[PDB]
Each structure stands twice: as structure tokens, then as C-alpha cells.
């Protein structure tokens, strides 16, 4: 069993090329389904949700009375926009290998606690760089911690069947619970965290985080610069103490990788690149993370 | 077992109100899940997909270099935009009744044959009324016949469990098969047809088509004007011969209702309004259609 998370930057800038880019991950996903693995699939949406959200603003409101599309709704559109491209491609690749399996894309709502510190400190800048319907302009939005998901129960079961399931698109839509009632809110959820929570609920072995590096380095552009091959939480904690990692780029991926393997000798997390990910699953590339 | 299809006009004009409108259908859907029924849920997307597709055109391309969003991709966004609102609301309503069930939204790709006559006659007008990346401007787009769906196999199983499944959003994204390869194409699929094909594959009893009428009438604004209560394919065929029905508004719903009950004494199709749909399930309103 293997949960794979594909960054939003790997899906490109326009539909045109997103349709292109997505083939690569899909073919890789197909090949594992052959080696006998269960691949649960996920993806980020930084660029795609931004493109969609801008656009409703960008000019559409400018050049008319077009409606107000909060960020939640643009994440909804981002999921169906991306899920569409992935659903074809991975279905398509599986067929090249004459394999029979249902590829699914679940629209994803991610449960977060409403008292999350993150809201009280609106972190991630978003949308038009102007100086915009009433939010905390600076705009900006939080990054809540993912506690669960609307259909996990049913999702894990589809994974129990041999269904190749695509979930946690862009990390899912931030959803709080208020008086036994759901309420989508505006903001984002880090897709690595999201997919790591999912990786846990389905209880896979491996959690692979796809990213544009062969290894995560420490002391970069320094004499003691070193590439991590294997490693563990204990060390990552020190490395993190000394700010080894780009706050955002690598830190969240590291932390999310830790959250998954922590106290589970039977599971690893791999942070490798797209080209070299089959190698990566055999120590030959990327950085393995363990309890 | 009951498949319900909710028109796009019933979801409104803007997210603001779509979030409002969707509560009504959801509460109705909740109540059936209580009477012991399995409710498979579906919806159209005429207005929503248009709003999204315009917008990328409307001004966004005008007021910048924003990307080219074909209609397929705007249907992808329309599904995740709508699936989001439905997923909350119907989950929410089910909780008011303290019921425990997983509500799911499957991104939907609808298989059509590429030789479909419909393409060679681009029927349904779409997008900017100008006089637009190269399609058949007149623009316009076909309305293929739905032969199946990427995950029906897996979808019907989730329905076998007690999962309340939302599918065929906007009728699904038109997808042809070319050399064992899938290829989303531009155009639409009538959601009533789509949901009727689905109604069949899951093999429910009832297929309810929600629409803004208490009954389907014949000979409207004529002396012999009459409301249909029960009826059958044989008669509908004559009524259709004499153009009893609005080509588009009622015709497709009628035909789709026929396609489902035809040769199945154990199943009906109900064409009733939203306010009066629980009544409708008991002969008290709407028009029942039978083999």
C-alpha cells in the first residue's frame, strides 16, 4: 500500500499542459498497481486554485457583474478541474497495461478544528496583490491542521477493494463543525499534511511526497552540506531546531512525513523527485524517513 | 431505491444562493434515507458551467493572458463547485436526523460513442454571444447519448453499501474511447439521460426528475388541455408525435423517463416539482411514467 502526493507545481500553468504533465505521474502510478501495490492518489492545487480564483476577480468582476467566488468554492472547482485530468490519465495508463480497476475521484472536505491557532494568524497570502470581499487583507488565509474527512470511512473501503482512489485534492476544502453542522470555510490545508492524515487512516506502508529534489539536504551551500538518505524523527527534530528547512517548501513535507511514520516501525516516508521515484522506492534515490 | 435528478436552474445564479437553494433538495433527500430508501443523487449544471466558462473568457482573457479553459474543464470545475455545496448540505441534513451514512461525490466522466450523430449536428448553444478558440461557432456544442461511466462498477457498489452517492454532475464530462484510450471532449450530456442511465446501472425502482411543474400537461392553453397523472410509453410516443412537449425543457426528461421504465413493470419515473415531491411519491402530485 502506497499513498502518493503530487505537488501543484507539477501540474503546470494551464489546462493545455496540465493535461500533458499529468501523464507522467499516472504512468508511474500505473506501474505500482502492477507490482501488486495499492496506490492511493492525491495532489496539491496552489497554482490551479489561484488561477481560478483570480480569474473570477481578475477581470470577470472588473468587466461585469460576475458572482462572488470565495476561496472555498474555487478549491471546489480546482478539485474537479484537476480530478478530471488525473481521472482520464491514470485510467488511461492502467489500460495500456491491460489492467482492470476502477479509478475514482472523491471531492474532498477536510475537517479542521475551528479553534485551530492557524486562523488567528492568517498565514498564506492568496489572490490579487491589490491594495476584495471582506477577509483579512494584508489577501491572506490560514493553514489549519487536518483532523479528518467527510467520507474517509467509505474512502478507505474503496481502497480495501482494488479501487485506485484519488482524494485530498489541494488538501481538501477546509471544513469546520459547529453544532453537529458542517461549514466550509476559506483558507487552505497543506496537501502533504492532508495526504499524511489520509495515509494514516487507510494505514498504508509508504507515504511518498513528490517534489523537485533528489534528496533533502542539510547545511546547503555550506562545507558540511549533506544529503539525507535514510533518517529518523529524532534527527529531523534537531535539523528542524537549526532551521535546516525552507519554511513552506520542505518543512511541512518533512513534518508531515514525520507525523505519519512516528511510532510505526512498519512504515516509511519517501521524499523524492518524479523522474527518479521508482529508484526512490529502492533506496537508490530520495530521502527515506522513519520512526 | 431512488435516483433523483436536480436541475441546474434549481441551484441558482451565484455561490451565495446556491449554498441556500441546495438545502431544500438535501432535506428532502435526507427524509427518504429515513423511510428506508436508497437515494442516489444527481444534478444538472447549465447555469453553473456557463458562469464558469464565460468568466475565463468574459474578462479574464480580456484583461490579461489567463489560460484557455475548454468547456470540458469548466464542467470539471462545475462538478466540484456544485458537489461541494451538495456534499455539505446533504451531509448536514442527514445529521439533523442523527443518521449515520457516508455522503460521496464522484467526479463523473460519461462515456459516449464518437460516432454519435449529435456531434455532426452541434445542437446546444454555449458561452459568449460574440460574432473564441476554434470550435463550431454559429458558439455551439453537441449532446451525445450516454453509454456508461468511468467508475459505475465501483459507484454501484458504494450504493450497495448504504453510501449516499452523488454522481452524474451536469451529466458528466463527455468522454469518448479511442484505441482503448479515454479522451474528454467538448460538449454536454443531458443530465436527465445521464441520470437515467445511472438509474438503470444501479437498478433502482424510482427515477425522479425534479422540475418546476406540478404535472406535465398536454394540449396546453387549449380546450383539451389535460394534466398527466399516470401514463405509459405507448401514449407518450403519440404525445411526442404531436409535439406535445417543449424540445429541450420537457421532451428530454420525458424521453429519459421512458428509457428507464421501458420493459420494466417493476419501476416508475416521476416528474414533479421540488415543493411537492414527497406528495409526488404517493400519486398525490406530479406525473408518473410507466412501461
Author numbering:
A (entry chain A), B (entry chain A): 3 to 133, 142 to 148, 157 to 309
Article excerpt on this structure:
The arginine deiminase pathway (ADI) is the most widespread anaerobic route for arginine degradation in microorganisms and performs the conversion of arginine to ornithine, ammonia, and CO2, generating one mole of ATP per mole of arginine consumed. The ADI pathway is composed by three catalytic enzymes: arginine deiminase (ADI, EC 3.5.3.6), ornithine carbamoyltransferase (OTC, EC 2.1.3.3) and carbamate kinase (CK, EC 2.7.2.2). Here we have described the structure of the three enzymes that constitute the gene cluster in the ADI pathway in Mycoplasma penetrans (together with the specific membrane-associated arginine permease coded by arcD gene) and compared them to previous structures of the enzymes. In this regard, M. penetrans possesses and expresses the complete set of the ADI pathway genes at the same time while exhibiting a fermentative metabolism.
Carbamate kinase (CK) generates ATP from carbamoyl phosphate and ADP, and this constitutes the last step in the fermentative catabolism of arginine, agmatine and allantoin/oxalurate. Crystals of M.penetrans CK display a unit cell composed of one molecule in the asymmetric unit. Based on results obtained by gel-filtration chromatography, by predictions of the PISA server and by previous structures of CK from other organisms, the biological unit can be considered to be a dimer.,, the structure can be divided in two domains, with a large crevice in the middle that creates the binding sites for the two substrates, carbamoyl phosphate (CP) and ADP. The N-terminal domain (residues Met1 to Ala222), rich in α-helices, is composed by two sets of four stranded β-sheets, the first sheet constituted by four parallel strands from the central β-sheet and the second sheet smaller and formed by mixed β-strands. This domain contains three long α-helices, α1, α2 and α3, which make up the entire dimer interface, and the mobile PSD domain (“protruding subdomain”, from Lys126 to Val159), which is involved in the catalytic reaction by an overall “rigid body” movement upon substrate binding. The structure here of CK from M.penetrans differs from the previous structures by the presence of two sulfate ions, one in the carbamoyl phosphate pocket and another in the β-phosphate ADP binding pocket. The gap in the electron density maps corresponds to the flexible PSD domain (“Protruding SubDomain”), and only residues at both ends of the PSD domain and the internal loop from Ala143 to Val150 could be partially modeled in the electron density, all displaying high temperature B-factors and giving as a result a poor agreement between Rwork and the Rfree in the final refined structure. However, the putative coordination of the phosphate group of CP shown for the E.faecalis CK is not complete in M.penetrans, since the sidechain of Lys126 (Lys128 in the structure of the E.faecalis CK), which belongs to the mobile PSD domain, is not interacting with the sulfate ion.
